[PDB]
Design a protein around this ligand. Structure first.
Ligand code: BOG
Ligand code: BOG
Ligand code: BOG
Ligand code: NH4
Ligand code: NH4
Ligand code: NH4
Ligand code: NH3
Ligand code: NH3
Ligand code: NH3
Ligand code: NH3
Ligand code: NH3
Ligand code: NH3
Ligand code: NH3
Ligand code: NH3
Ligand code: NH3
Lengths: 383, 383, 383
C-alpha cells in the first residue's frame, strides 16, 4: 500500500502524545501520590524502565507483538526492525510510525506499574520484572489483541487497550502490591494534600496524551479517530462527574483526588470502547466507570486501609474490566455503536469480552508473579 | 463535502492543544496566583466544571451554538449529536471534530472564569453559575460570532474569540469579583513569589495550546492556519516585550509575572486578529496589547489594591477589547491584512468591532449577574 | 510548488512542540538546577529573551538565515517577511510555517544558553548578548548548515542541529560560564534533590518537544520523519541506559539526574544523525552519547568542582560533537543509514563533520565572547 501523509502526521503526533503520558504524565501522577522521600527513586525507575521498554520494543517486542506468528506471539523476523523497509506501509502509515506508536503503549503500560511500585521495589529488581513481564505478558497480550492473535481471532473488541494496557497492568501492579510489603510511616496514612496538584497535573497530561492513545488507535485521521476523540472527551467528563457525584454522596464533598480519579476512570473505561460506541454510550460508560472506580478504590481501602499509589490499579483494573464489558453492549448499533462483527450477537460479544478479561487477568497475573519471583530470587524484590 | 484527513489530523491535534489550555494550563496558571490553602478547591472546581462543560456541550451546547437557528441561538436538532452522521463533514473536517474543537473553546472560557473565582465561590454555586452562563452567554455569543448569528451577520471580525472567549469570560469574571467578596489574609496582599513558577508553567501551557486555539480556528492546515500561527508567535513575543518594557519603565525592573502577563496579553490581543492581519500588524497589536494589559491591571490594582487572581480578567478584558478593535484596523490590506468584506471600509469595520464588544460585554455581564444571583439565591455564592 | 496540507499540519504541530521545548521545557529544566532564589529571574530572562528571539527572527533572522546570499548569511529581502506571499511554499509547506519552525529552533538554542546563565547575568546584559549572538552566531551558522551556506556546501550532515543548536549553544554557554563568575553559597555545592522533579519534568517536555524538533526537520510527514521519530525514541532510551549504566558503575547507583542527563545526551547525540541513520545506529549513538555525556560532565566537575546548571553545556557540547561525528559513520548504508552524497566516502564525511564542528565551536565561541564583552562594556555582565 501507500502511506497517507495526513495519517503519518496524525500518528506521529499521537505517538508523541502517548509518550507524553509516561514522560512525564504518569511520573507526575504518581509523584503526587507517594512520599517526598521516594519520589526521586520512582522518577528514576520510571525513566529507566521507560528507556528499557523502548529498547526492548525495537529489539524484539514489535516483532513478537505485531509480527505474524501464532495465537500468542508473532515472530522474530523484525528484530531491531530488520527487514522493514523504511517505506514499508502498515495500514495507511509508514510501518516505522506503527512501531513507534505501539511502543508508546508498551511504555505507558509499564509506567503504570512502575510508577506505583517503584518506591517499594529494588532498582535491579524492577528491571528484571519489566523484562520478564514486558516480554511474556505485554507482548503476548498485545499480540493476542492487536497482532491477530487469540483474542482478536475470537472477535474481542478493545479499541485502544482496556485489556492490553489497563487490565494487564492493573493485575501486574496488584500482584506486586500483594507480594511486596510497604511500611507506612506514621502520619503518612493518607495522601498528602500538598502534593495533590502534581497528581492533577499528571492526570491532565495523561488526559491530553490519551487523545493520542485513543484517537491514534484508529490508525488514521478519519471519522473513527474523530469518534474516539469525542468519546474520550465525553467519557472522561462523565466519569469525573460520576465519581464526584458518588463521592459527594458518600463523603459529603467532592475532592481533587476524586475528580482526577474520575477522569482516569472514564479514560480507562472508554479505552476499549471509544472507536466502537456512540457518544451516548460514551457518556454512560463514563458515568458507570467513574462510579465503578470509586467503588473499586473504596474496596481496596477496605483491604489496604491506607492510601497507597497502588490504589491506581483498582481504577485501571475495575474500570478496564467495566469498559471492556460495556463495550460488548454499547458497540451495538441499536445503541449508536458500530457494529458487531458478522454473526455476532450482543450476548456472544459479551462472553467474548469476559473471556478476554479473564485471559488477560490470569496471563498477566501469572507472568507478573513469575517476574516478581525471579527478581526476588536473583536480586531481592523489597527495598 | 468530503473530509480532508490532513485537516482532520490538524484539527484533532489543535483540539487536544485547546483542551490542554484548560487541563492543566489555566489550572496551573491560577494555581500560582492563589493561596496554597485554596488551590485544591480551585483545581477541583476547574476539573469538575470542565467536565460539566464537556457534557453540556455535547448534550445541547454544540447544537445551540452551531446549529442554524436565529441571530442568537441555533437549534436542538443536534442534541447529544443526534442526526450527525459520523461521516458528516463540516468545512473540510468530520463534523465530530468540529464539535470537539468548539467544545474545547467552551472549556477554556469557563476555566478562565472558574480558575479565578473558585476560591471564593461555593462548589454547588459554581456549578449552577456555569450551567447558567454557559447556556445563556457562551452559547448565544458563540452562535452570534461563529454560528452565523448576529455578530457574524454584521461582519464582526473575530478569528479565534476575542469576544466569545476573552471578553465574554472577562466580564463574567469581573462581575463575579464584584459580587463575591474575598477576605485577604494578613501578609497575602501580593502574589506569593514562591508560587510564580506555576504561573509561568501555566502561561507556557496556555501559550502552546493557544497555537491549537488560534491556528485551529482556520479549520484547516492551510495558509491562514500558518498565518495565524506566525502571528501568535509574533504578537505574544511583542506583548511580552511591550509589557516588560512598560513595567521596566514604571517599576524599574521587569518581573516574571509581568512577562507572563505580557504573553497572555499578546495571546488575547491577537486572538480576534490572528487570521486577518499581517505579521507587522501582529507585532503592533502585541506591543499595544502588552501595554494595554499592563495599564488594565494597573487600573484594577487601584480598585482592588491587592493582587488577586481576578486581575487576570483585566488582561483578558482589556486586551480582548484592544485586539478586537485593532483587528478592525489591521485587517486592512493596506496594512498587510486580509481584507475587509464586501462594501466594508475600515471605519465601518471599527464600528462593527465596537458593536460586537459592547454586545458581548452587556450580554455576558447580564447573564453572569443572573447566574451568580441564581446561585446565591439557591445555594449561596460565598464560601 | 504547492503545499501539502498533511505536511502543513505536521509542521505546525512540530513547531508548537519545538516552542514547548523552550516554553516551558528548558525553563523548568534549569529551574530544577538552580537555587530557589534565582529561579524567578531565570524564568523572566528565558521568557523575555524568548520573546526577543521570536521578534528578531521575523524582523531579520529568517531572512538572513534562510534567504539566499553567501556562504555565511542570506539576505535582507525577507525583513519582517516582506515579499513572502502567504501562499508561498517552501519545500511542501507554506513558507510561513517554515519561518515559524525555524524560529522555534532559534528560541530553544537561546533558551539553552539563557536558562543556564540567567542567574549570573544582568538582565540588560543578557538582552545585549542575545542580540549579538543570535545575529552573528545563530543566524550565520543556521545559514551555513540549513540555508545553503558553507557547511551545507561542504556536505556536512546535520539533520536537526547538532551544530546549529547544540554545539553552538554549548560553546556560547561555556564561554559565558568562563567569563562570568558565580558565588556558590555555602551548602549549595550540589544540586538540591528537592528540586530535581522539576529537572525531570523539564527533561520530559524537552523530550516530547524534541519529536517536533527531530522529526519536523524532515519538513514533511514522510518516512524520513518517521525514521527520525523512531531514532529519537531509540537513541534517547539507549543514552538513558548508557548513562545510568556508566553511573551505576562509577558511583554504585543510578540517579534521577543521571537518567535525565542520559535522555538529553541521546537527544542531543541523535539530533544531527536522526534522519540519516538506521535504528541500530541510533541505539549505538545513544549509548555512546550517554556515556560521553557522563564523561563530559565528569570532566566539567573536575574543572568546576560544584554542580552548576552550566554543566548542561557539557552534555550539549560533548554529545553534540559525538553525534555529529557519529553521523559521519552511521549515515553509511552499510550500517543501515541513508547514504553519503555523491562521491563521498565515510572518511571524507568524517572530515567534513569535524570541520563543521570546529567551525561551529570557533564561530560561536568568538561571537559569544564578543557578545559578552559588549554587554560587559556597556551595561555590565555580572549580577
Ligand atoms: C487514581 C487515584 C487512586 C487512588 C484514588 C483515591 C481517590 C479518592 O480516594 C478514595 O475516595 C473515596 C470516596 O471519596 C473512598 O470511598 C475510597 O476509599 C478512597 O480511597
Ligand atoms: C495575568 C496576570 C494577572 C495579574 C497581573 C500581574 C502582573 C504584574 O502585576 C502588575 O504589575 C504592574 C507593573 O509592574 C502594576 O502596574 C500593576 O498594578 C500590577 O498589578
Ligand atoms: C544535564 C544535567 C547536567 C548536569 C548533569 C548532572 C548529571 C549527574 O551529575 C554527574 O554525575 C556523574 C556520575 O554519576 C559524575 O561523574 C559527574 O561529575 C556529575 O556532575
Ligand atoms: N492501540
Ligand atoms: N474558533
Ligand atoms: N531543522
Ligand atoms: N493510563
Ligand atoms: N492509557
Ligand atoms: N493513570
Ligand atoms: N486564555
Ligand atoms: N484562549
Ligand atoms: N490566561
Ligand atoms: N535541547
Ligand atoms: N534541542
Ligand atoms: N537540554
Amino acid at each position: 500500500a501507500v502511506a497517507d501523509k495526513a495519517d503519518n502526521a496524525f500518528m506521529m503526533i499521537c505517538t508523541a502524545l502517548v509518550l507524553f503520558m509516561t514522560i512525564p504524565g504518569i511520573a507526575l501522577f504518581y509523584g503526587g501520590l507517594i512520599r517526598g522521600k521516594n519520589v526521586l527513586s520512582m522518577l528514576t525507575q520510571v525513566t529507566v524502565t521507560f528507556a528499557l521498554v523502548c529498547i526492548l520494543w525495537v529489539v524484539y517486542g514489535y516483532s513478537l507483538a505485531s509480527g505474524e506468528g501464532n495465537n500468542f506471539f508473532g515472530n522474530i523476523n523484525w528484530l531491531m526492525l530488520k527487514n522493514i523497509e523504511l517505506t514499508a506501509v502498515m495500514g495507511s502509515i509508514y510501518q516505522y510510525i506503527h512501531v513507534a506508536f505501539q511502543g508508546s503503549f508498551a511504555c505507558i503500560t509499564v509506567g503504570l506499574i512502575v510508577g506505583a511500585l517503584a518506591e517499594r521495589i529494588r532498582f535491579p529488581a524492577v528491571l528484571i520484572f519489566v523484562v520478564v513481564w514486558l516480554t511474556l505478558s505485554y507482548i503476548p497480550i498485545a499480540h493476542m489483541v492487536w497482532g491477530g492473535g487469540l483474542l482478536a481471532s475470537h472477535g474481542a473488541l478493545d479499541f485502544a487497550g482496556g485489556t492490553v494496557v489497563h487490565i494487564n497492568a492493573a493485575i501486574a501492579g496488584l500482584v506486586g502490591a500483594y507480594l511486596i510489603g510497604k511500611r507506612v510511616g506514621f502520619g503518612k496514612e493518607a495522601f498528602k494534600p500538598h502534593n495533590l496538584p502534581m497528581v492533577f497535573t499528571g492526570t491532565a497530561i495523561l488526559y491530553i496524551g490519551w487523545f493520542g492513545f485513543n484517537a491514534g488507535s484508529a490508525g488514521t485521521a478519519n471519522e473513527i479517530a474523530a469518534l474516539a476523540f469525542v468519546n474520550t472527551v465525553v467519557a472522561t467528563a462523565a466519569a469525573i462527574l460520576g465519581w464526584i457525584f458518588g463521592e459527594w454522596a458518600l463523603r459529603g464533598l467532592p475532592s481533587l483526588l476524586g475528580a482526577c480519579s474520575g477522569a482516569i476512570a472514564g479514560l480507562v473505561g472508554v479505552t476499549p470502547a471509544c472507536g466502537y460506541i456512540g457518544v451516548g454510550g460514551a457518556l454512560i460508560i463514563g458515568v458507570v466507570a467513574g462510579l465503578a472506580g470509586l467503588w473499586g478504590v473504596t474496596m481496596l481501602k477496605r483491604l489496604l486501609r491506607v492510601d497507597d499509589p497502588c490504589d491506581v490499579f483498582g481504577v485501571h483494573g475495575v474500570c478496564g474490566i467495566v469498559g471492556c464489558i460495556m463495550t460488548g453492549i454499547f458497540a451495538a448499533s441499536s445503541l449508536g455503536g458500530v457494529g458487531f462483527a458478522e454473526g455476532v450477537t450482543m450476548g456472544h460479544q459479551l462472553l467474548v469480552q469476559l473471556e478476554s478479561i479473564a485471559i488477560t487477568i490470569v496471563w498477566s497475573g501469572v507472568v507478573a508473579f513469575i517476574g516478581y519471583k525471579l527478581a526476588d530470587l536473583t536480586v531481592g524484590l523489597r527495598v
